[PDB]
């Protein structure tokens, strides 16, 4: 049908998202390992 | 009868819209996340210079 070419086009659209989700949440990751990078430099920087 | 088939496919259409439009977000999401990532960067490059 219609529907079972309309639901295939979601569906591919659907992992699409879920692999975008967990892209953000990796980068996420990330800026917390540079935010604690920071701190280790900053407190490093405060012993002058 | 073919109403009902008219509302069925204008269902799924929007459904499939709503997730195209959900895909478009997260990539724009994606792009903020890496200009953040961007600007931690130089920020670490910055105090990393100040510590020499």
Redesign the interface.
């Given at each position: 049908l219609?529907?079972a070419e309309?639901?295939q086009?979601?569906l591919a659209?659907?992992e699409?998202?879920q692999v975008?989700?967990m892209?953000?949440k990796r980068?996420?990751h990330?800026?917390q390992l540079?935010?604690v990078?920071?701190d280790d430099?900053?407190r490093?920087?405060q012993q002058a």
């Amino acid at each position: 049908l219609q529907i079972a070419e309309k639901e295939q086009e979601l569906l591919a659209s659907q992992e699409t998202v879920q692999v975008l989700q967990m892209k953000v949440k990796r980068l996420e990751h990330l800026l917390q390992l540079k935010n604690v990078r920071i701190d280790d430099l900053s407190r490093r920087l405060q012993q002058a």
